[PDB]
């Protein structure tokens, strides 16, 4: 089961951009993947002081990594044991969902389909596959296999719906046009476009301190699409 | 003994600089820039000291650029003709080494015998390459390694090695479109990578502009050529003496 961490391009503007459209020219990747989490190195003085102070503690006098150990005495799992546990649950029991949970998820997915269609009436640029539903399922069975129970429950799933909902929120989230101003070249530069193409854009944008591959294509694809 | 008198006669005069400059490349007509550009490679700096430490340069470099038919090549041929310890290649076909050593293996009987070759076999001298713009990426990097680290490091499937080449490199490089592009930055025109670019000082670009003194001189000179008389136009010093003169001028530690 693949766990992948991609690196997004150009930073925050890619959020300003359509949420998909990131990976190569194709979102299909993101379609195959069940749980997509857009994250960031967000900084909050509260949290930033938390992490910082924690590091100051880490260097010396050194003795913070003990909190885990008293978590071990009191509550928390040694992670040397967690592994054995995972093996255990993994081989022993194979979970199965309950009917009311099923119909509950039917309601879930039809509300998703209908509502988000209505959202896409405006051609809002972003998605929904039955594969996503199947994902939600696999989460329910996974967590059911946490409890170790041979049977699923409703609240159990009630967690999963919302969790995946956070994932949808991740599915949901102007341009200077400077580079996109390929018009100047296309015009008064080249009516035949020839002797230029991707090559021209380079020499013209090669020593102009300026153009990235995705940048060049984006502005190109942009203008291609834009109809300019 | 008999010649040293001539050498003295050369150093005495106040014009022999100008004589040098005008007498360099008879075949070529004018330009006056690349004359100095060519000679000042033959006579190099101290290329020594300053320790502790890393050593200064020393030597010199030039890359002639211009619209073809400008006879930029005549200079080249004149240098490979005139000065000893001078290699001439037309690379694009370098092809690779070429400008470096093979190294030759086997011999037989232990091998590690080293090919000359191209660039390095001309050492403490002037290597002349046509068309930097044709040799693409592979070798240009090697040349950079020659004009940066000053040493040529060679390890192939066998005995590791380091072979010194201390050289001046005279190149002739054609513009992107073989033309100016006056309005374009030279930086953008020559089309060779930045690090090798910044090591060549300086370029001495040749361009054609309307002129009347030089024009008159051309018409005069050409009609002269076709005219058996007078072809009596000549320079000052010949081609043989200018060598012993230079070699004398090399023994100085300015």
Swiss-Prot record, chain A:
The source's domain of life comes to Eukaryota
Q: Where are the transmembrane segments?
A: none
Annotated signal sequence range: none
Motif Arginine finger boundaries: 31-34
Tell me where it resides: Nucleus
Q: What does this protein do?
A: Acts as a component of the MCM2-7 complex (MCM complex) which is the putative replicative helicase essential for 'once per cell cycle' DNA replication initiation and elongation in eukaryotic cells. The active ATPase sites in the MCM2-7 ring are formed through the interaction surfaces of two neighboring subunits such that a critical structure of a conserved arginine finger motif is provided in trans relative to the ATP-binding site of the Walker A box of the adjacent subunit.
Q: How does it assemble?
A: Component of the MCM2-7 complex. The complex forms a toroidal hexameric ring with the proposed subunit order MCM2-MCM6-MCM4-MCM7-MCM3-MCM5; loaded onto DNA, forms a head-head double hexamer. Interacts with CSM1.
Q: Which family does it belong to?
A: Belongs to the MCM family.
Additional detail: Present with 10300 molecules/cell in log phase SD medium.
What name does the UniProt record give this protein?
Minichromosome maintenance protein 5
Q: Complete protein: which residues are present?
A: 518 to 760 of 775
UniProtKB/Swiss-Prot annotation, chain B:
| Annotated MCM domain residues | 16-223
- GO function terms (MF aspect): ATP binding; ATP hydrolysis activity; DNA replication origin binding; single-stranded DNA binding; single-stranded DNA helicase activity
Listed GO CC annotations: CMG complex; cytoplasm; DNA replication preinitiation complex; MCM complex; MCM core complex; nuclear pre-replicative complex; nuclear replication fork; nucleoplasm
Whether Cell cycle counts among this entry's keywords is yes
Q: Where does ATP bind?
A: 66-73
Q: Where in the cell is it found?
A: Nucleus
Q: Name one GO biological process term.
A: mitotic DNA replication
Give UniProt keywords alphabetically: ATP-binding, Cell cycle, DNA replication, DNA-binding, Helicase, Hydrolase, Nucleotide-binding, Nucleus, Phosphoprotein
* Motif position, Arginine finger: 198-201
Q: What is its main location?
A: nucleus
- Bilayer-crossing residues are none
Question: Main role?
Answer: Acts as a component of the MCM2-7 complex (MCM complex) which is the putative replicative helicase essential for 'once per cell cycle' DNA replication initiation and elongation in eukaryotic cells. The active ATPase sites in the MCM2-7 ring are formed through the interaction surfaces of two neighboring subunits such that a critical structure of a conserved arginine finger motif is provided in trans relative to the ATP-binding site of the Walker A box of the adjacent subunit. The six ATPase active sites, however, are likely to contribute differentially to the complex helicase activity.
| Family label | Belongs to the MCM family.
> What other remark does the UniProt record contain for this protein?
Present with 13400 molecules/cell in log phase SD medium.
Q: Subunit composition?
A: Component of the MCM2-7 complex. The complex forms a toroidal hexameric ring with the proposed subunit order MCM2-MCM6-MCM4-MCM7-MCM3-MCM5; loaded onto DNA, forms a head-head double hexamer. Interacts with MCM10.
Q: What is this protein called?
A: DNA replication licensing factor MCM6
Parent sequence residues shown: 510 to 763 of 1017
């Amino acid at each position: 089961s693949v766990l992948a961490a991609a690196n997004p391009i150009y930073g925050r503007y890619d959020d300003l951009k359509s949420p998909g459209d990131n990976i190569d020219f194709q979102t299909t990747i993101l379609s195959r993947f069940d749980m997509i989490f857009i994250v960031k190195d967000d900084h909050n003085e509260e949290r930033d002081i938390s992490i910082a102070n924690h590091v100051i503690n880490i260097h010396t006098g050194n003795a913070n990594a003990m909190q885990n150990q008293q978590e071990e005495n009191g509550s928390e799992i040694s992670i040397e044991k967690m592994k054995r546990y995972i093996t255990y649950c993994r081989l022993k029991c194979a979970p199965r969902l309950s009917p009311q949970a099923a119909e509950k998820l039917s309601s879930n997915f039809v509300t998703i389909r209908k509502q988000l269609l209505i959202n896409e009436l405006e051609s809002t640029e972003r998605p929904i596959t039955i594969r996503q539903l199947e994902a939600i399922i696999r989460i329910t069975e996974s967590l059911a296999k946490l409890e170790l129970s041979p049977i699923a429950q409703e609240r159990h799933v009630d967690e999963a719906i919302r969790l995946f909902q956070a994932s949808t929120m991740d599915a949901a989230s102007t341009s200077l046009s400077e580079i996109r101003r390929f018009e100047q070249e296309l015009k008064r530069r080249l009516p035949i476009g020839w002797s230029t193409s991707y090559q021209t854009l380079r020499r013209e944008f090669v020593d102009t301190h300026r153009f990235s591959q995705l940048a060049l294509d984006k502005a190109l694809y942009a203008l291609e699409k834009h109809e300019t | 003994s008999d010649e040293i008198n001539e050498l003295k006669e050369m150093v005495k005069d106040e014009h022999i600089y100008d004589k040098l400059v005008r007498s360099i490349a008879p075949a070529v007509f004018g330009h006056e820039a690349v004359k100095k550009g060519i000679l000042l490679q033959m006579l190099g700096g101290v290329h020594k000291s300053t320790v502790e430490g890393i050593k200064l340069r020393g030597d010199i470099n030039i890359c002639v650029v211009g619209d073809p038919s400008t006879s930029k090549s005549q200079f080249l041929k004149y240098v490979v003709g005139f000065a000893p310890r001078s290699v001439y290649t037309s690379g694009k076909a370098s092809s690779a080494a070429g400008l470096t050593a093979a190294v030759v293996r086997d011999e037989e009987g232990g091998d590690y015998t080293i090919e000359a070759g191209a660039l390095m076999l001309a050492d403490n001298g002037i290597c002349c390459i046509d068309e930097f713009d044709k040799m693409d990426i592979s070798d240009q990097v090697a040349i950079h390694e020659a004009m940066e680290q000053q040493t040529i490091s060679i390890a192939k499937a066998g005995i590791h090695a380091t072979l010194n080449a201390r050289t001046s490199i005279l190149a002739a490089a054609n513009p992107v479109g073989g033309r100016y592009n006056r309005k374009l930055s030279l930086r953008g025109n020559l089309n060779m990578t930045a690090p090798i670019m910044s090591r060549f000082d300086l370029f001495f670009v040749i361009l054609d502009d309307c002129n009347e003194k030089i024009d008159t001189e051309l018409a005069s000179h050409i009609v002269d050529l076709h005219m058996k008389r007078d072809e009596a136009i000549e320079p000052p010093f010949s081609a043989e003496q200018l060598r012993r003169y230079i070699k004398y001028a090399r023994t100085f530690k300015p």
